[PDB]
């Protein structure tokens, strides 16, 4: 019964490593690992290395495709130092570990042979600032599709992929819970752009960033596990981020375990869960690769689109 | 101000013909032309021939892409007599001329060098039959997304693209206004499948045929012109299709010009216009190529996705 997809387990997947080199040390992996994430070198080797191989294979093939169009159009040819940027989306729930997957992927790709320039941008820079969300009644919907300046986000990625020298994204601060005035992330004709955020795989009545992706990941897990990870990270942040007096959620620093669980579950119930179910999970069917994690953050299963 | 698209006029577009051969005679073009359509050899040469070139370029590049995935997976390689089928979508309003564009494209592609097997399937075979539409209260919504068995349609295209030997689509009769019992269109590992229908470029919370397209056309025109074409074809069918006593709309055969205009405008107003505005036109942004026709059915402008 034919399928666009093929499923693997970790055994099956890790065999596809071939002889892709491991270019990353244990200390280097630490700088990449997010609070609460469990990634080790073994996981890098068995899961991320075949991924990086898949992508290397696709970057070459995908260039052919733009080149055929440029040929058709009777066009100059290509700068071989500036190919069309390969755009990689990374999607999934809050707390599922997207930021680790993306940082690790970036680090692996930047260590391929020619040392490609590999940029990583998070869509939280494209959230409306609080004063605008407040205007729109959206202060309790950060991460919902409507809380983003989608036009700006699409402009940004179109600019990069169309080969602009320079493009700027705004910058969000979790600690201050708002866009940072005057802050910009500048992307300068990278070879590869990884775009990471809850809703990057969305589709709609207009052309969207997902329509520009040459590859996408969705980082998945059971909803109950993701909630547990969220609540557990909320409790852990009492003595990390929330302990900063400047932190927007500094008042949570002093909560007891049981108060903190209450608070975190209410945020999950009223914001992150509804967003996952209504907006994020309906984008999973389109991902080129789903990385499914077990309750321990271990990626044990994968679903690859072959069509 | 960068753009996924590039616009042409007919001058600009026709220069991209290069020396693509014209393999089609005036008599052959007649068999392809729909009631009310204006296509001539000149239009074939200036518009359809560069299109066919673009596609030839893309079929080769696109194969590379599946081959890279097959390589990654350590897979046999490919039957060179059975490559992965290249899937072409053709979308747009009722009465806009999709069936002519698709028949002409099929005829041009089947006349490339190796004589590729080029199948053409219309999504009207995937409409629910009347008894089922009646059950669902949809007898006045034929052509709306919900009037189709989308699961069956997706099964069909997945099967073909995944390399099945044989796949069957049901068959709709306009004359009898219903799916034809026991009729099947059998598609046998074509090299190219053209899938034509109002809503083929739709996207949604599940993987859809548009997610399987290697190329798509949208046949566009101003809404007022399309309505004029629709009403004018309705009046012309009084002495063609509706004149058949078996015809479902045989009672319209005897209408005066002015009665027929009334009838046809009401159908446009209550079915086809709402469908165009709510469902079809929101898919235009995704088409690889928009063919924009002037009031005379003349394709005078084109919009190509380069990203
Ligand atoms: N300072 C601070 N950082 C947070 C908070 N919530 C999430 N983060 C960080 O924001 C980044 C994105 O987190 P999240 O949106 O849950 O996406 P994830 O990467 O898939 O877990 C991660 O580095 C989190 O550690 C918060 O409340 N305060
Ligand atoms: N017999 C008959 N054929 C029709 C009728 N309406 C449309 N057709 C034919 O059905 C095919 C599809 O028409 P339409 O859905 O308008 O799509 P188009 O190909 O873009 O014009 C065309 O060949 C039309 O000639 C009808 O009421 N009766
Ligand atoms: C910033 C986020 C919306 C994620 O943004 P992303 O980069 O995935 O677009 C999420 O990490 C977040 O901080 N949500 C806050 C929910 C609340 O208002 O408490
Ligand atoms: C059959 C159609 C819905 C087009 O089908 P398609 O192949 O575009 O999916 C349209 O040609 C049609 O016949 N509409 C009928 C509207 C009515 O019920 O009178
Ligand atoms: Na996590
Ligand atoms: Na027409």
XYZ file of C-alpha atoms and ligand atoms in Angstrom:
710
model
C 0.000 0.000 0.000
C 2.206 2.800 -1.423
C 3.318 5.767 0.617
C 5.174 9.017 0.180
C 7.158 8.065 3.296
C 9.639 5.479 4.540
C 9.973 4.745 8.301
C 13.211 3.750 10.028
C 14.322 2.693 13.433
C 17.704 3.755 14.787
C 19.404 0.523 13.638
C 18.177 0.980 10.076
C 18.937 4.690 10.113
C 22.448 4.506 11.567
C 23.591 2.101 8.824
C 23.145 4.997 6.393
C 26.012 6.876 8.007
C 28.503 5.261 5.665
C 31.850 6.907 6.388
C 30.761 10.458 7.101
C 33.391 11.871 9.526
C 32.565 12.920 13.096
C 33.995 16.433 13.385
C 32.610 17.351 16.803
C 34.070 16.955 20.297
C 32.275 16.432 23.600
C 33.082 19.970 24.717
C 31.800 21.373 21.419
C 28.547 19.446 21.806
C 27.954 21.029 25.238
C 27.894 24.515 23.727
C 25.113 23.281 21.464
C 22.972 21.417 23.984
C 19.869 23.150 25.330
C 18.613 23.060 28.904
C 16.991 19.684 29.435
C 18.268 18.129 26.201
C 20.016 14.725 26.283
C 22.026 14.628 23.065
C 25.367 12.758 23.195
C 28.020 11.965 20.553
C 26.538 8.544 20.126
C 23.238 10.179 19.061
C 25.104 12.614 16.852
C 26.795 9.676 15.104
C 23.807 7.424 14.691
C 21.193 10.074 13.837
C 22.746 13.368 12.847
C 25.508 12.042 10.635
C 23.306 10.190 8.085
C 21.069 13.284 8.180
C 24.053 15.408 7.237
C 24.846 12.924 4.459
C 21.294 13.002 3.056
C 21.526 16.777 2.973
C 24.946 16.867 1.256
C 23.523 14.605 -1.430
C 20.481 16.890 -1.814
C 22.373 20.182 -1.902
C 24.120 19.075 -5.091
C 20.991 17.686 -6.792
C 18.980 20.738 -5.771
C 21.458 23.131 -7.373
C 20.978 21.263 -10.673
C 17.329 22.244 -10.425
C 17.890 26.007 -10.182
C 20.576 25.707 -12.847
C 18.100 24.140 -15.296
C 15.775 27.093 -14.805
C 18.671 29.532 -15.268
C 19.631 27.665 -18.422
C 16.057 27.809 -19.689
C 16.086 31.565 -19.122
C 19.372 32.031 -21.035
C 21.050 33.347 -17.916
C 24.717 34.148 -17.124
C 25.197 30.825 -15.263
C 26.037 31.095 -11.563
C 28.632 32.435 -9.216
C 30.249 29.191 -7.966
C 31.180 31.027 -4.750
C 27.541 32.183 -4.520
C 25.114 29.373 -5.376
C 21.405 29.689 -4.574
C 21.112 29.310 -0.783
C 19.852 25.909 0.411
C 17.070 26.576 2.926
C 16.367 24.160 5.769
C 13.303 24.455 7.991
C 13.119 23.076 11.535
C 9.703 22.812 13.123
C 7.866 21.428 16.114
C 6.468 22.154 19.577
C 7.860 24.450 22.232
C 10.171 22.373 24.511
C 10.692 19.581 21.947
C 14.354 20.564 21.388
C 14.314 22.326 17.994
C 17.044 24.717 19.060
C 19.433 21.807 19.776
C 18.690 19.964 16.545
C 19.302 23.148 14.597
C 22.515 24.133 16.411
C 23.851 20.620 15.972
C 22.890 20.453 12.305
C 24.493 23.846 11.704
C 27.736 22.676 13.353
C 27.862 19.489 11.321
C 27.205 21.235 8.007
C 29.721 24.009 8.713
C 32.301 21.239 9.029
C 31.744 19.740 5.565
C 34.688 19.979 3.208
C 34.521 23.442 1.594
C 33.478 24.991 4.921
C 30.111 26.343 3.707
C 28.763 29.479 5.430
C 25.820 28.125 7.460
C 23.455 30.593 9.077
C 20.800 29.804 11.619
C 17.826 32.087 12.246
C 14.929 31.623 14.651
C 11.488 32.930 13.775
C 11.008 34.412 17.215
C 12.737 37.566 15.927
C 9.659 37.952 13.711
C 7.179 37.946 16.545
C 5.314 41.217 16.850
C 6.716 43.218 19.773
C 4.613 43.271 22.949
C 3.071 46.696 22.315
C 1.789 45.490 18.955
C 0.641 42.108 20.287
C -1.137 44.020 23.042
C -2.801 46.175 20.381
C -3.952 43.027 18.594
C -5.060 41.292 21.818
C -2.384 38.630 21.288
C -0.276 38.863 24.433
C -1.378 35.316 25.360
C -0.817 33.877 21.883
C 2.882 34.230 21.310
C 3.816 31.405 18.980
C 0.402 31.242 17.320
C 0.610 31.981 13.571
C -1.065 35.354 14.002
C 1.529 36.540 16.547
C 4.170 36.771 13.815
C 4.911 39.391 11.195
C 4.683 36.813 8.397
C 5.202 39.354 5.591
C 8.482 40.453 7.158
C 9.550 36.829 7.710
C 8.753 35.923 4.091
C 10.521 39.065 2.828
C 13.547 38.001 4.853
C 13.778 34.471 3.440
C 12.899 35.552 -0.119
C 15.706 38.083 0.042
C 18.241 35.526 1.215
C 17.222 32.867 -1.287
C 17.085 35.319 -4.192
C 20.790 35.985 -3.522
C 20.835 39.349 -1.727
C 24.184 40.422 -0.243
C 22.719 41.346 3.134
C 19.381 40.707 4.912
C 18.331 41.609 8.464
C 16.048 39.814 10.925
C 14.921 41.339 14.228
C 15.930 39.704 17.533
C 13.737 38.363 20.350
C 14.850 38.104 24.011
C 13.225 35.419 26.146
C 14.773 36.976 29.211
C 13.073 40.349 28.566
C 10.053 38.747 26.884
C 10.098 41.138 23.901
C 11.790 42.098 20.667
C 15.058 43.928 21.449
C 15.108 47.498 20.227
C 17.652 48.057 17.482
C 18.976 44.504 17.482
C 19.476 42.847 14.131
C 20.776 39.520 12.903
C 22.560 40.057 9.623
C 22.661 37.240 7.100
C 25.150 37.679 4.237
C 24.688 35.298 1.300
C 25.111 32.087 3.299
C 25.480 28.777 1.469
C 22.856 27.306 3.775
C 20.203 28.948 5.923
C 18.513 26.989 8.666
C 15.237 28.587 9.700
C 13.874 27.288 12.993
C 10.520 27.921 14.688
C 7.163 26.409 15.751
C 5.221 27.208 12.607
C 7.762 27.358 9.782
C 6.063 24.513 7.894
C 2.724 26.301 7.657
C 0.938 26.678 4.356
C -1.719 29.180 3.340
C -3.416 31.375 0.743
C -0.121 33.045 0.135
C 3.375 31.948 -0.665
C 5.156 31.245 2.654
C 8.654 30.354 3.900
C 7.764 26.652 3.800
C 7.305 27.075 0.035
C 10.969 28.105 -0.067
C 12.428 25.170 1.912
C 14.770 22.746 0.127
C 14.539 20.445 3.180
C 12.688 20.441 6.462
C 12.830 18.669 9.811
C 9.988 18.222 12.206
C 11.065 17.348 15.772
C 8.268 15.237 17.185
C 7.375 13.384 20.403
C 4.229 12.297 22.214
C 2.270 15.291 23.442
C 2.347 14.070 27.084
C 6.131 13.758 26.988
C 6.550 17.262 25.525
C 4.381 18.665 28.315
C 6.499 16.852 30.881
C 9.620 18.281 29.286
C 8.065 21.761 29.318
C 7.034 21.639 32.989
C 10.349 20.126 34.019
C 12.295 22.843 32.177
C 10.072 25.478 33.791
C 11.028 24.118 37.251
C 14.716 24.013 36.268
C 14.647 27.635 35.108
C 13.838 28.868 38.592
C 17.533 28.687 39.378
C 18.757 29.565 35.887
C 16.974 32.170 33.757
C 14.178 33.123 36.178
C 16.730 33.768 38.951
C 17.924 36.828 37.020
C 16.193 39.831 38.597
C 15.839 41.231 35.080
C 13.963 38.128 33.990
C 10.376 38.716 32.985
C 9.395 35.639 35.006
C 11.572 36.410 38.002
C 8.559 36.036 40.278
C 8.548 32.329 39.449
C 12.031 31.811 40.868
C 10.638 31.473 44.401
C 7.751 29.132 43.564
C 7.736 25.736 45.230
C 7.938 22.651 43.070
C 4.199 22.279 43.366
C 3.325 25.912 42.664
C 5.662 25.844 39.641
C 4.029 22.711 38.236
C 0.648 24.429 38.517
C 1.873 27.562 36.755
C 3.647 25.691 33.976
C 0.742 23.341 33.246
C -1.627 26.260 32.928
C 0.663 27.937 30.352
C 0.901 24.628 28.502
C -2.885 24.151 28.639
C -3.806 27.683 27.532
C -1.029 28.474 25.026
C 1.395 25.771 23.940
C -0.879 22.740 23.794
C -3.659 24.430 21.720
C -0.976 25.797 19.426
C 0.648 22.398 18.965
C -2.657 20.648 18.228
C -4.259 23.386 16.053
C -1.276 24.716 14.158
C 1.972 22.816 14.525
C 1.033 19.139 14.254
C -1.007 19.765 11.091
C 2.293 20.721 9.446
C 4.025 17.430 10.265
C 2.834 15.652 7.070
C 4.972 17.977 4.930
C 8.321 17.646 6.726
C 11.087 15.961 4.701
C 12.170 14.196 7.931
C 10.403 13.604 11.186
C 12.705 12.889 14.160
C 10.607 11.108 16.735
C 11.912 11.174 20.328
C 11.016 8.849 23.167
C 10.186 10.049 26.690
C 13.921 10.411 27.347
C 14.601 12.816 24.414
C 16.197 9.922 22.543
C 15.537 9.978 18.820
C 14.536 6.365 18.211
C 12.429 6.584 15.014
C 12.520 8.541 11.709
C 10.041 9.163 8.830
C 11.584 10.278 5.551
C 9.645 11.644 2.565
C 10.740 9.906 -0.553
C 7.951 11.650 -2.437
C 12.631 44.343 -4.130
C 13.265 40.572 -4.453
C 10.606 38.135 -5.541
C 10.105 34.421 -5.937
C 8.649 35.192 -9.377
C 9.647 36.588 -12.760
C 7.003 38.112 -15.101
C 7.133 37.956 -18.898
C 5.191 39.296 -21.793
C 4.735 37.234 -24.945
C 7.734 38.858 -26.684
C 10.039 38.033 -23.785
C 8.567 34.566 -23.385
C 8.643 33.523 -27.042
C 12.386 34.257 -27.303
C 12.909 31.335 -24.920
C 11.690 28.892 -27.546
C 15.197 28.455 -28.891
C 14.980 25.738 -31.538
C 12.400 23.442 -29.996
C 10.649 21.729 -32.961
C 6.953 22.227 -33.751
C 5.591 18.691 -34.082
C 1.892 19.512 -34.375
C -0.307 20.161 -37.415
C -3.391 22.352 -37.720
C -5.655 19.313 -37.941
C -4.018 17.789 -34.860
C -4.554 21.011 -32.918
C -8.301 20.913 -33.683
C -8.675 17.576 -31.906
C -7.189 19.253 -28.847
C -9.131 22.514 -28.857
C -12.080 22.851 -26.483
C -15.402 24.507 -27.242
C -14.842 28.246 -27.121
C -11.040 28.063 -27.009
C -8.958 30.157 -29.445
C -5.588 28.414 -29.534
C -3.710 28.499 -32.872
C -0.278 27.210 -33.970
C 1.138 30.654 -33.502
C 0.151 30.485 -29.802
C 1.483 26.957 -29.559
C 4.837 28.168 -30.912
C 5.197 31.320 -28.884
C 3.803 30.041 -25.567
C 3.635 26.272 -25.428
C 6.995 25.505 -26.978
C 9.195 27.358 -24.427
C 6.945 25.798 -21.764
C 7.756 22.376 -23.154
C 11.445 23.327 -23.132
C 11.364 24.492 -19.495
C 9.782 21.178 -18.583
C 12.309 19.054 -20.520
C 15.072 20.858 -18.658
C 13.315 20.214 -15.324
C 12.519 16.548 -15.911
C 16.239 15.784 -16.081
C 17.216 17.909 -13.058
C 14.301 16.543 -11.050
C 15.360 12.940 -11.623
C 18.767 13.806 -10.122
C 16.880 14.719 -6.967
C 15.148 11.356 -6.491
C 18.384 9.630 -7.466
C 20.279 11.396 -4.659
C 17.738 10.108 -2.159
C 17.981 6.595 -3.626
C 21.754 6.843 -3.381
C 21.522 8.001 0.225
C 19.347 4.979 0.977
C 21.817 2.544 -0.648
C 19.217 1.544 -3.200
C 19.439 -0.587 -6.382
C 19.591 2.519 -8.631
C 16.708 2.948 -11.077
C 15.042 1.291 -13.994
C 16.045 3.638 -16.855
C 12.874 2.568 -18.695
C 10.927 3.324 -15.490
C 12.096 6.563 -13.861
C 10.039 8.220 -11.119
C 6.996 9.740 -12.859
C 7.145 13.521 -13.370
C 3.831 14.939 -12.138
C 2.361 18.099 -13.646
C -0.636 19.877 -12.142
C -2.982 22.121 -14.131
C -5.321 24.354 -12.181
C -7.769 27.203 -12.538
C -11.422 28.205 -12.897
C -14.186 26.379 -14.710
C -14.328 27.714 -18.320
C -10.766 29.109 -18.266
C -9.518 26.447 -20.725
C -7.547 24.024 -18.519
C -8.595 21.058 -20.618
C -7.045 22.620 -23.755
C -3.796 23.605 -22.065
C -3.445 20.092 -20.709
C -4.301 18.301 -23.972
C -1.881 20.530 -25.841
C 0.887 20.078 -23.285
C 0.370 16.314 -23.351
C 0.645 16.281 -27.163
C 3.818 18.339 -27.158
C 5.522 16.235 -24.488
C 4.521 12.943 -26.126
C 6.402 14.187 -29.183
C 9.748 14.732 -27.434
C 12.572 12.520 -28.622
C 12.257 9.221 -26.713
C 8.460 9.328 -27.064
C 7.702 9.387 -23.314
C 4.394 7.844 -22.176
C 2.350 10.904 -21.140
C -0.908 10.360 -19.300
C -3.535 12.955 -18.596
C -6.101 12.567 -15.818
C -8.845 14.961 -14.755
C -9.886 15.187 -11.124
C -13.555 15.124 -12.014
C -13.355 11.310 -11.912
C -12.750 11.770 -8.176
C -15.915 13.707 -7.540
C -18.293 11.888 -5.238
C -21.139 10.381 -7.273
C -24.486 12.192 -7.099
C -26.053 9.831 -4.553
C -23.171 10.489 -2.176
C -23.107 14.242 -2.843
C -26.848 14.218 -2.205
C -26.208 12.414 1.085
C -23.687 15.093 2.030
C -25.919 17.969 0.859
C -23.361 18.842 -1.828
C -25.341 18.565 -5.052
C -24.853 22.322 -5.602
C -21.145 22.301 -4.748
C -19.585 20.149 -7.408
C -16.060 21.449 -7.818
C -15.774 22.682 -4.236
C -12.960 20.908 -2.345
C -15.423 18.951 -0.232
C -17.183 17.479 -3.290
C -14.149 15.308 -4.046
C -12.943 12.022 -2.623
C -9.540 13.513 -1.777
C -8.219 10.343 -0.102
C -8.902 8.356 -3.265
C -7.337 11.079 -5.435
C -4.216 11.190 -3.245
C -4.017 7.376 -3.191
C -4.173 7.458 -6.980
C -1.317 9.931 -7.464
C 0.817 8.421 -4.677
C 0.476 5.047 -6.353
C 1.538 6.374 -9.737
C 4.467 8.378 -8.410
C 5.688 5.555 -6.171
C 6.085 3.487 -9.362
C 3.084 1.133 -9.341
C 2.505 -0.886 -12.526
C -1.191 -0.045 -12.731
C -3.489 2.522 -11.045
C -7.177 3.241 -11.685
C -9.151 6.492 -11.529
C -12.946 6.651 -11.806
C -14.575 8.498 -14.730
C -17.019 11.425 -14.697
C -19.535 12.163 -17.496
C -20.611 15.772 -17.971
C -23.321 14.613 -20.321
C -24.909 12.365 -17.656
C -23.813 14.625 -14.791
C -22.439 11.749 -12.681
C -19.647 9.255 -12.202
C -20.023 6.436 -14.761
C -20.636 3.058 -13.194
C -17.774 0.650 -13.772
C -15.700 3.041 -15.860
C -12.018 3.267 -15.080
C -9.046 5.133 -16.478
C -5.991 2.941 -16.172
C -2.593 4.560 -15.800
C 0.402 2.245 -16.308
C 3.751 3.639 -15.145
C 3.719 6.717 -17.385
C 6.864 8.824 -17.715
C 4.754 11.915 -17.111
C 1.339 12.348 -15.529
C -0.591 15.545 -16.047
C -3.280 15.987 -13.415
C -5.854 18.633 -14.288
C -8.671 20.111 -12.190
C -9.988 23.222 -10.379
C -8.424 22.553 -7.003
C -5.311 20.468 -7.654
C -3.030 23.115 -6.123
C -4.782 23.067 -2.757
C -2.844 22.639 0.450
C -4.050 21.458 3.841
C -3.493 19.654 7.139
C -2.644 16.566 5.199
C -0.303 15.666 2.412
C -2.108 16.378 -0.892
C -1.543 15.878 -4.636
C -0.068 19.380 -4.896
C 2.680 18.174 -2.537
C 3.530 15.601 -5.211
C 3.739 17.964 -8.215
C 7.108 18.435 -9.940
C 5.572 21.340 -11.907
C 2.249 23.114 -12.009
C 0.354 25.485 -14.280
C -2.371 27.837 -13.254
C -4.540 29.085 -16.148
C -5.680 32.542 -15.141
C -7.780 35.419 -16.519
C -9.836 38.286 -15.133
C -12.878 37.003 -13.286
C -15.288 39.022 -15.494
C -13.788 37.526 -18.646
C -14.047 33.968 -17.282
C -17.716 34.561 -16.484
C -18.281 35.843 -20.004
C -16.568 32.760 -21.380
C -18.712 30.546 -19.138
C -22.024 32.154 -20.140
C -21.058 32.202 -23.801
C -20.130 28.502 -23.726
C -23.414 27.751 -21.955
C -25.314 29.434 -24.835
C -23.211 27.558 -27.411
C -23.939 24.209 -25.761
C -27.642 24.519 -26.472
C -26.956 23.201 -29.951
C -24.073 20.918 -28.984
C -24.116 18.938 -25.732
C -27.488 20.095 -24.362
C -29.202 19.163 -27.649
C -28.610 15.493 -26.816
C -31.866 14.196 -25.328
C -29.735 12.188 -22.903
C -28.052 15.357 -21.694
C -28.707 16.220 -18.082
C -29.292 19.833 -19.140
C -31.373 19.029 -22.195
C -34.092 21.364 -20.948
C -31.718 24.262 -21.572
C -31.470 23.504 -25.283
C -34.692 25.421 -25.981
C -33.908 28.481 -23.851
C -33.729 31.820 -25.617
C -30.472 33.722 -25.583
C -31.809 35.831 -22.760
C -33.190 32.969 -20.672
C -29.883 31.106 -21.118
C -27.845 34.101 -19.962
C -30.006 34.278 -16.836
C -29.576 30.579 -16.091
C -25.835 30.564 -16.703
C -25.141 33.670 -14.614
C -27.016 32.203 -11.687
C -24.891 29.016 -11.825
C -21.775 31.177 -12.036
C -22.949 33.351 -9.125
C -23.966 30.481 -6.826
C -21.328 27.838 -7.648
C -18.379 28.704 -9.865
C -17.640 32.260 -8.776
C -17.648 31.524 -4.988
C -15.480 28.497 -5.676
C -12.996 30.491 -7.740
C -12.707 33.272 -5.149
C -12.713 31.084 -1.986
C -10.754 28.064 -3.128
C -9.089 28.283 -6.515
C -7.501 31.738 -6.643
C -5.875 31.254 -3.226
C -3.845 28.474 -4.857
C -2.427 30.688 -7.612
C 0.611 31.834 -5.553
C 2.030 28.292 -5.599
C 1.836 27.544 -9.334
C 5.208 27.130 -11.082
C 3.725 29.031 -14.066
C 0.722 31.255 -14.389
C -0.619 31.642 -17.955
C -2.630 34.828 -18.003
C -5.174 35.187 -20.834
C -6.747 38.356 -22.156
C -10.475 38.715 -22.878
C -9.919 36.885 -26.172
C -8.378 33.720 -24.605
C -4.975 34.904 -25.806
C -2.162 34.112 -23.406
C -0.345 37.446 -23.299
C 1.471 37.325 -19.923
C 3.324 34.704 -17.813
C 4.569 34.504 -14.176
C 7.277 31.935 -13.509
C 8.452 30.830 -10.054
C 12.182 30.917 -9.902
C 11.991 30.193 -6.186
N 15.304 32.720 29.269
C 14.347 31.874 28.865
N 14.537 31.060 27.815
C 13.574 30.232 27.394
C 12.318 30.195 27.978
N 11.580 29.311 27.304
C 12.329 28.795 26.326
N 13.551 29.344 26.411
C 14.687 29.095 25.518
O 14.192 29.514 24.218
C 14.714 28.602 23.217
C 13.547 28.004 22.436
O 12.741 27.192 23.302
P 11.396 26.539 22.774
O 10.620 27.624 22.136
O 10.783 25.766 23.879
O 11.846 25.662 21.532
P 12.719 24.294 21.476
O 14.113 24.750 20.966
O 12.102 23.356 20.506
O 12.763 23.724 22.970
C 15.396 27.455 23.981
O 16.794 27.753 24.100
C 14.837 27.572 25.388
O 15.876 27.171 26.271
C 12.057 31.065 29.032
O 10.949 31.106 29.575
N 13.095 31.892 29.490
N -21.241 17.976 -21.984
C -20.845 19.014 -21.235
N -19.545 19.318 -21.102
C -19.146 20.339 -20.334
C -20.034 21.109 -19.600
N -19.324 22.003 -18.909
C -18.031 21.820 -19.186
N -17.939 20.822 -20.079
C -16.707 20.261 -20.642
O -15.997 19.769 -19.474
C -14.579 20.017 -19.664
C -14.058 20.836 -18.487
O -14.670 22.133 -18.481
P -14.393 23.151 -17.297
O -14.627 22.412 -16.038
O -15.154 24.394 -17.557
O -12.817 23.335 -17.300
P -11.850 24.074 -18.375
O -11.168 22.908 -19.141
O -10.831 24.874 -17.652
O -12.803 24.954 -19.310
C -14.453 20.887 -20.926
O -14.214 20.029 -22.051
C -15.852 21.440 -21.129
O -16.043 21.551 -22.534
C -21.387 20.791 -19.662
O -22.226 21.417 -19.008
N -21.791 19.748 -20.510
C 9.213 32.401 21.440
C 8.367 31.151 21.224
C 6.980 31.631 20.816
C 9.032 30.287 20.148
O 9.339 31.066 18.981
P 9.936 30.448 17.608
O 11.400 30.703 17.384
O 9.628 28.846 17.625
O 9.066 31.102 16.441
C 8.282 30.337 22.525
O 9.612 29.940 22.872
C 7.838 31.243 23.668
O 8.696 31.881 24.294
N 6.537 31.205 23.985
C 6.099 32.060 25.110
C 4.703 31.716 25.643
C 4.303 32.741 26.720
O 3.887 33.861 26.339
O 4.625 32.465 27.901
C -16.716 18.830 -13.193
C -16.252 20.211 -12.743
C -16.605 20.327 -11.265
C -14.747 20.333 -13.000
O -14.040 19.207 -12.457
P -12.426 19.069 -12.443
O -11.863 18.121 -13.464
O -11.811 20.566 -12.648
O -12.060 18.587 -10.966
C -16.978 21.302 -13.545
O -16.632 21.127 -14.922
C -18.482 21.063 -13.490
O -19.000 20.308 -14.326
N -19.166 21.780 -12.588
C -20.630 21.576 -12.543
C -21.383 22.654 -11.755
C -22.873 22.276 -11.670
O -23.212 21.415 -10.825
O -23.609 22.694 -12.598
Na 13.509 19.849 25.139
Na -12.561 28.492 -22.086
